[PDB]
Design a protein that fits this description.
part of a larger assembly, 5 chains, A mainly alpha (about 70), B mainly alpha (about 130), C alpha/beta (about 575), D alpha+beta (about 190), A: about 70 residues, mainly alpha, about 0% strand, C: about 575 residues, alpha/beta, Rossmann fold, eight-stranded parallel sheet, six-stranded antiparallel sheet, binds zinc ion, Non-structural protein 8 (chain E), Non-structural protein 7 (chain A), viral protein/rna
């Protein structure tokens, strides 16, 4: 199941990078640190909270329309 | 050289979801498996290359034992006796890829192809003979 | 990859010399190249001979070989011609239907947009060809604007007066408000905008949106913008319902709004409704009336120009909650009493070229006579609504067609909405005119309104007409009738009360001369639409089709609320004018 | 290679040679019916060779091009495909801590900074109305990201402070509504 | 291949062939008739196979010398670019503070690394953290390379302007922190 977390972390960092996040140095540094550390985790009980911390980054902007894109 | 320093980042890398879904449907990547994902594309922040120069920091001036080094070089030279070598003219040079960068200055104007056409064989030979003195 | 404009068949072949680069199916593309001068074929790569130093660009001379396209001179031994067997080789070759007749598409894609026939084909062809015609006409106008030369400020003689040096080898655009320039400030290596400007003969009298202190170096060019592709039709399909759909009428309405209640219900009975509003009938009164009639409905107010939507906001501010209204402005001074750039607000006010992608219960089109099929298609691509309300008037002016030189554009060819209501009749009609006295109303009711326009006021006995040819003089891009102005001057001396009137004429040069001679405020008929004054003085100044435009003349003499004086050169319209005639002094 | 005219020529030659062989006519006459027969394959096994090469040029030309119509189209729609894939996998993950914030952010509640993992750091959240205030905050506690956070501060959008008991439903409009709330992980 | 002379010989031999074949004289007469065309089919062979294989080499020659001309134009373009780059970077040399230090050399040779140290008129320091900022670039004026420099501009990693009042100890965590401080050599 940890593979799912690592793959979705890869996808989340991809969309974050393409949302021009890397135009702010420190935010991109923290996101890169979280993404690199999630890929190296060995238990699912730390990857999940680092994953939620990394998702809180994208849930703070206003470039991703959320209600539309969770059309289910 | 410029009025501003440049910070270079590295991209996270793309995900091929269809292959992963196919593999998972085939009973791969379960818990307690001898095979698992360990190779990824790792991203970097702004200060990456200037952090790699602090690894060239590791080089130190070293004095070698000269007599042992001379004997060792004489012994090592015997592993390269079956080969042959020497200088060649500009006609005999074989270049693998001509679409690669030519360096610091010169990348602002073209690839290595441009500088190998422009100069004829005589110019290349003149440059090579200049480099010998 | 796209869709064939004549077949909807999937295709990748685009006519290369054809300006909008439309997708043409193999049979359609073959006919378009064989029946016109278009010989460039664009596909994923061009079907151009990739041999060095070759100029062969006609597909009927090209052969496919190896992995590329060659001319006959440069082709390899093994190949098959790209143009053979009544079709051009390309994507989606098997899936191809073709068309029986390609004449309309060829005519539109080959016309220079200088004949009324081009517009009649554009507004009478199929919906997809209608869209392509709109695209190519706007693109042609945009490129023609670039054909005009650069005008640079050589000397600033004074304020509101300049001296301009014009680019050599290029035509100078006509100097009227229909040609909106833009200044540019000279910098180290580039240029920066200094605002939008208009010009008129003096020296040249300039009127910029933002005042500045421009000096020698600034230059003016007519701003051009990228012409976007079209996908949505000019009109959504008609739907008729048995009940009001998606709307809830209020149970309490005021007598200011009772007359349109029946029309407000019909708006709910159909997918889209066409509304015709005579001068001073309450087009703003109606459209804002749909808002209070359906309080819970989300309504987007749209219009071609900034002026009309602001006037809608002005009437909306009078009747609608300021907190539920929003004025969308792109990144020109406009309405600034609503919150700016709030798409999700209940009441959204914005223009055609700046509308966001959103949905609404009702979408209101005002001033539809100045609307084109392009503006019709764009908003429908931007707004999806349960009900659609088009407000305008065929007897009023259209959007100017600069490229048009031959013939006159009838109202039923202005756009799709104008075509229906000129043929099938308007869905609703307000028969009450409140602004002009009966004599103007009766004159304009017979002329253009099928005698359907009723007056609210009585006869005012201040509507006066005179037949006077005078002497017509022409400058670079307009006309002047000084004796016609001189008659007005003599009229003012004998009737001093008429010096509160506003001078109107179909020519800007006539207004410029009359302003210095008479001192009255001056307005062109095109710019006078949407305004009103107590008294107006109208000088035809010519007998040309421009001056004799039955839509324009309807607009011209109907800006007066009490009285009017009309110095006429055309006998036909003079006889139609039910005013009290005079003898020439 | 059947719909060609020199196919009819080859068929006529084959019929003539079949008649010659079945009849046993002569020695030079059947050589004439094999003279103009083996040549009939020299303008058949040739003209049916360039064209047969032409066809495979076609099927594979139509291929180096669908995959460019495809390559140049796929790199022109990245920004929506990546996002939809992200949310599909996120929904497939089915984790409560992620789902809580997903729903909070879809309706009203977005944080103003990275949610901290340590038990000390500060968290600032935006509450748009009172309805979400009921679901998330109950008294002096704040349940968010499947964790407990004690409120230390709530201030309205006009940067004015507000207390933790006034907030109710009778001062419903007597509160500015984009409340912001500061909390500390318990 | 139609305007070749052998086409006429082939055509006339074939015309005589069909004429006498319709006439049908005899084998003793048609022997020469069907041998002349058999050698005419051999002539047109030769010369038509001596021609269509030269159109390939001529085309190849045209393409090759097209390519060589293209290369020779690109060479001139790159030559002009290199020369103008040299000439525009020479004009920043500050040819008065460099001449003095060169003239003091015994032979005229001076190490390269001391040319910007004693001649350049702009200094750009890169600062990783506030503590390193305190010991090196403190205040509006500092000293380095046995000279006195005065601060004019400070930017962060995002290349946005930072005032000298914002660089404190407690406010440091709110800054992108490869700070680039540029200054001019004061006199
Ligand atoms: Zn050597
Ligand atoms: Zn075309
Ligand atoms: Zn077609
Ligand atoms: Zn060619």
């Amino acid at each position: 199941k940890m593979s799912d977390v690592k793959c979705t972390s890869v996808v989340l960092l991809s969309v974050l990078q393409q949302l021009r996040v890397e135009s702010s140095s420190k935010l991109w540094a923290q996101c890169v640190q979280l993404h690199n550390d999630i890929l190296l985790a060995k238990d699912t009980t730390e990857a999940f909270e680092k994953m939620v911390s990394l998702l809180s980054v994208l849930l703070s902007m206003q470039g991703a329309v959320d209600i539309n894109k969770l059309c289910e | 050289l410029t009025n501003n320093v440049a910070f270079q980042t590295v991209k996270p890398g793309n995900f091929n979801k269809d292959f992963y879904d196919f593999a998972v449907s085939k009973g791969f990547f379960k818990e307690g498996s001898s095979v698992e994902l360990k190779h990824f594309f790792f991203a970097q922040d702004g200060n990456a290359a200037i952090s790699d120069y602090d690894y060239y920091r590791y080089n130190l001036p070293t004095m070698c034992d000269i007599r042992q080094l001379l004997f060792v070089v004489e012994v090592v030279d015997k592993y390269f006796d079956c080969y042959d070598g020497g200088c060649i003219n500009a006609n005999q040079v074989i270049v693998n890829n001509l679409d690669k960068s030519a360096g610091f200055p010169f990348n602002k104007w073209g690839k290595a192809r441009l500088y190998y056409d422009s100069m004829s064989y005589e110019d290349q030979d003149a440059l090579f003979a200049y480099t010998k003195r | 990859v796209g869709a064939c404009v004549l077949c909807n068949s999937q295709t990748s072949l685009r006519c290369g010399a054809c300006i909008r680069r439309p997708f043409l199916c193999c049979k359609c593309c073959y006919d378009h190249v064989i029946s016109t001068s278009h010989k460039l074929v664009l596909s994923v790569n061009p079907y151009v001979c990739n041999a060095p130093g070759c100029d062969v660009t006609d597909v009927t001379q090209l052969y496919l070989g190896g992995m590329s396209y060659y001319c006959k001179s440069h082709k390899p031994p093994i190949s098959f011609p790209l143009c053979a067997n009544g079709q051009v080789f390309g994507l989606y070759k098997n899936t191809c239907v073709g068309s029986d007749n390609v004449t309309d598409f060829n005519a539109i894609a080959t016309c220079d947009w200088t004949n009324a026939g081009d517009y009649i084909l554009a507004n009478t062809c199929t919906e997809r060809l209608k869209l392509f015609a709109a695209e190519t006409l706007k693109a042609t106008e945009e490129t023609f604007k670039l054909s005009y030369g650069i005008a640079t400020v050589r000397e600033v003689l004074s304020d509101r007066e300049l001296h301009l040096s014009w680019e050599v080898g290029k035509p100078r655009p006509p100097l009227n408000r229909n040609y909106v320039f833009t200044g540019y400030r000279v910098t180290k290596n580039s240029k920066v905008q200094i605002g939008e400007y208009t010009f008129e003969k003096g020296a040249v009298v300039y009127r910029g949106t933002t005042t500045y202190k421009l000096n020698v170096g600034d230059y003016f060019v007519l701003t051009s913008h990228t012409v976007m592709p079209l996908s949505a039709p000019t009109l959504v399909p008609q739907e008729h319902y048995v009940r009001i759909t998606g709307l809830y009428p209020t149970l309490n309405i005021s007598d200011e709004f009772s007359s349109n209640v029946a029309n407000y219900q019909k708006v709910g009975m159909q997918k889209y409704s066409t509304l015709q509003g005579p001068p001073g009938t309450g087009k703003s009164h109606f459209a804002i009336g749909l808002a209070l009639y359906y309080p819970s409905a989300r309504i987007v107010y749209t219009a071609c120009s900034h002026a009309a939507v602001d006037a809608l906001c002005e009437k909306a501010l009078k009747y609608l909650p300021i907190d539920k209204c929003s004025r969308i402005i792109p990144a020109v001074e406009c309405f600034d009493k609503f919150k700016v750039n709030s798409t999700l607000e209940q009441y959204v006010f914005c223009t055609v070229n700046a509308l966001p992608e959103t949905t609404a219960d009702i979408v209101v089109f005002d001033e539809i006579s100045m609307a084109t099929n392009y503006d019709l298609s764009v908003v429908n691509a931007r707004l999806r609504a349960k009900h659609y309300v088009y407000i305008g008037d065929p007897a009023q002016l259209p959007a100017p067609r600069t490229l048009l030189t031959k013939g006159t554009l009838e109202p039923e060819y202005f756009n799709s909405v104008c075509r229906l209501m000129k043929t099938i009749g308007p869905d609703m009609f307000l028969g009450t005119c409140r602004r002009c006295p009966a004599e103007i109303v009766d004159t304009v009711s017979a002329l253009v309104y099928d005698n359907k326009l009723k007056a609210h006021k009585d006869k005012s006995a201040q509507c006066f007409k005179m037949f006077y040819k005078g002497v017509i003089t022409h400058d670079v891009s307009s006309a002047i009738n000084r004796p016609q102005i001189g008659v007005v001057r003599e009229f003012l001396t004998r009737n001093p009360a008429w010096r509160k009137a506003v001078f109107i004429s179909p020519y800007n040069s006539q207004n410029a001369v009359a302003s210095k001679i008479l001192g009255l405020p001056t307005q062109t008929v095109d710019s006078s639409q949407g305004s009103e004054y107590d008294y107006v003085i109208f000088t035809q100044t010519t007998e040309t089709a421009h001056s004799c435009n039955v839509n324009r003349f309807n607009v011209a003499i109907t800006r007066a609320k009490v009285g009017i004086l009309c110095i006429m050169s055309d006998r036909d319209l003079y006889d139609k004018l039910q005013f009290t005639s005079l003898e020439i002094p | 290679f059947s719909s060609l005219p020199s196919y009819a020529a080859f068929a006529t030659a084959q019929e003539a040679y079949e008649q010659a062989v079945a009849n046993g006519d002569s020695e030079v006459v059947l050589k004439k019916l094999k003279k103009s027969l083996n040549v009939a394959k020299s303008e058949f096994d040739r003209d049916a060779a360039m064209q047969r090469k032409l066809e495979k040029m076609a099927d594979q030309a139509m291929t180096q091009m669908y995959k460019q119509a495809r390559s140049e189209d796929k790199r022109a729609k990245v920004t929506s495909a990546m996002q939809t894939m992200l949310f599909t996998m996120l929904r497939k993950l089915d984790n409560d801590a992620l789902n809580n914030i997903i729903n909070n952010a879809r309706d009203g509640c977005v944080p103003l900074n990275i949610i901290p993992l340590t038990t000390a750091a500060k968290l600032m959240v935006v509450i748009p109305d009172y309805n979400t205030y009921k679901n998330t905050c109950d008294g002096t506690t704040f349940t968010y990201a499947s964790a407990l956070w004690e409120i230390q501060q709530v201030v309205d959008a006009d940067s004015k402070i507000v207390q933790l008991s006034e907030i109710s439903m009778d001062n419903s409009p007597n509160l500015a509504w984009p409340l912001i709330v500061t909390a500390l992980r318990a």
